[PDB]
């Protein structure tokens, strides 16, 4: 215990981490040497870091940093269209995380997140089916991006963890900083019998995870916790959240009891049909659980307070019905001094739900009018694309967006498409104007149900990384999978 | 067998496949750009 | 002319020079550094 | 050289020892 294991992790750090760096470092001094002697020789023939400095000085490792948008400079001047396009390669990124090769166990709920320099990752391990099966596991990678030898990049990790208890946990997420990553857990109300009793509250698990040391467990429950309504039940987004300064942002849903009056939000382009009002109506009992107007599914945002302190608090703020559809997974994002939410679909809107708020408030929260990520798998809706009429119907899949500019107008994703066998994937860009850049990927995978995607700065461009969950063969049990891109920018002229 | 198993696959996966990929792959660019100076020695200095 | 020696711009970090914790409980304190023809040597008092 | 300190990141934060790196230029300067 005190001499083999730290020895251990020392070796492994050592060869995983320092190594590559070192090789890269030298291929990257190489190359430039190579230009500067072939621009000499070129012009011979004839027939010291200040930015650097306090940037790069406190960092452990540098092969990633924050993204940083893209400007049109240059692109400008001539009439031009300054556009950004993905890559045509969609690179592998190889044991982001431990697996198995059982046929009784699903792997699901995904949780990506990317710091300053390390990466944080969740998955769940459920007996038998994906959605109702028992909890037989909750997996917890805390690791590096690095630079190894092939053309993307690469995931070394430092600390694999599992989370105690799991049987009594009803859903959770990570969030990454730099040098930490935090993990907030739900968990239900167990009693009498050991079986805990499904969809309940009990309050959170805070953990947090440092590299070479031992995790840090916070138990927040009681009276450390004031939600602004009686929440019978409580999940946590599986997008993940985010640290800013010494407090942490996340989303969650849940079955929260009111007694007002409900005029649920409804948008749609002319419907049609039956209408008359009915659509209001089924607009309303949508948001509802099992009908009584008591009990509706809510989306809110959650904030921990004074994490360095020891004795974390959490605090929420609902969203009126009339601002939201049906509660849902979703995700918190910073983006530039200003915020943003994704929320997946549920329900009948299948329509892409993003929105900006400079403040992580309720009331200064606005939503993007765009529609290009439309999910089309693992619906029950038979409401057509065009125009989204008001129905009753369960989604149930997670495709969220990441913005390349400060407001949001650029962003890539990806579109998941249903076929005879299994589906037809693409990745693809989104600009100003409203044009699409496509390229379709994972030909040889039989389907894929879900994405993530985080981007980053590798070499002096954009990259992103997007985590899926599917089934490379008809009959294989659905694993999650890890794969690299990259962002390239144009100034075309018509 | 819960902690030291998955490092030591781990150590050996990193020291018998990667390292020697990443090293090979140096030495292929740099003889390909000793080529390419060569060629362009060639091209220019010719006179 | 004045010959002078300066401090350099950058203020770098040397990670793991010796082992940490993450209990809250616990104050490292009292360090001693040295450092030899090729080696170094340093110690630490961990307090309750 | 390499300096050894005490101290803490955050307010709230125990106590801990962090170590720092940096270089002594010669300068010759002309008046
Ligand atoms: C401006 O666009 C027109 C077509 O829309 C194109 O013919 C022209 O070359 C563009 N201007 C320049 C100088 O690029
Ligand atoms: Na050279
Ligand atoms: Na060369
Ligand atoms: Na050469």
Redesign the interface.
């Known amino acids: 215990k005190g001499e ?3 020895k ?2 020392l ?2 750090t050592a ?2 981490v320092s ?2 760096g070192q ?2 470092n ?2 990257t001094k ?2 430039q040497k ?1 230009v500067y ?2 621009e000499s ?2 012009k011979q ?6 930015d ?2 306090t940037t790069d ?4 490792d540098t092969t990633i940093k924050p993204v940083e948008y893209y400007k049109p400079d240059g692109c400008n001047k001539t009439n031009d269209h300054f556009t950004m396009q993905p890559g045509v390669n969609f690179y592998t990124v190889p044991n982001l995380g ?1 697996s198995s090769s059982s046929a009784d166990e699903c792997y699901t709920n995904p949780s990506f997140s990317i710091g300053s320099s390390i990466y944080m990752f969740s998955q769940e391990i459920r007996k038998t089916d994906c959605t109702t099966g028992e909890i037989l596991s909750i997996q917890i990678v805390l690791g590096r991006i690095v630079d ?3 053309q993307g990049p690469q995931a070394s ?1 430092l600390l ?1 963890w599992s989370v105690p208890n799991p049987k009594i946990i009803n859903s959770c997420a990570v969030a990454a900083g730099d040098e930490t990553g935090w993990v907030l857990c739900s968990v239900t109300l167990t009693a009498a019998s050991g079986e805990p009793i499904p969809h309940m509250f009990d309050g959170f698990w805070l953990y ?1 995870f ?1 590299p ?5 467990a916070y138990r927040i429950t009681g009276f450390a916790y004031l939600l602004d309504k009686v929440y019978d039940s409580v999940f946590i987004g599986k997008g993940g959240g985010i640290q800013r300064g ?1 407090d942490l942002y996340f989303q969650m849903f849940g079955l929260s009891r009111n007694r007002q009056s409900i005029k649920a939000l409804c948008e749609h382009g002319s419907c049609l049909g039956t209408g008359g009002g009915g659509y209001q109506v089924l607009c309303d009992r949508a948001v509802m659980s099992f009908g009584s107007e008591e009990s509706l599914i809510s989306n809110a945002y959650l904030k921990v307070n ?1 994490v ?3 004795k974390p608090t959490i605090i929420s703020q609902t969203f009126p019905p009339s601002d939201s559809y049906k509660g849902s997974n979703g995700r918190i994002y910073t983006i530039g001094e200003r915020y943003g939410i994704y929320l997946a679909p549920s329900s009948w809107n299948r329509y892409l739900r993003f929105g900006l708020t400079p403040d992580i408030s309720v009331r200064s929260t606005t939503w993007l009018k765009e529609k290009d990520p439309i999910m089309k798998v693992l619906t029950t809706c038979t409401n057509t694309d065009k125009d989204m009429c008001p129905e009753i119907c369960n989604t149930r899949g997670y495709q969220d967006i990441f913005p390349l500019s400060e407001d949001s107008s650029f962003y890539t994703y990806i579109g998941i498409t249903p076929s005879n066998e299994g589906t037809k994937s693409f990745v693809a860009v989104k600009d100003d104007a409203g044009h699409v850049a496509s390229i379709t990927i994972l030909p040889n995978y039989y389907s894929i149900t879900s994405a993530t995607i985080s981007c980053f700065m590798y070499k002096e461009e954009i990259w992103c990384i997007a985590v899926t969950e599917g089934r490379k063969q008809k009959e294989n049990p659905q694993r999650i999978y890890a794969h690299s891109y990259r962002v390239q920018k144009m100034c075309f002229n018509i």
Do not use: H, M, R, W
């Not at 023939?45 to 200040?50: G, H, L």
């Not at 000085?57 to 452990?60: E, P, S």
């Open positions: 083999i294991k730290p251990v992790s070796i492994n060869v995983s190594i590559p090789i890269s030298l291929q190489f190359l190579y002697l072939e020789i070129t023939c004839t027939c010291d870091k200040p650097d400095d000085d406190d960092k452990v431990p190894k030898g092939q990790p694999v947090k440092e070479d040391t031992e995790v840090v010494n004074d360095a302190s020891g």
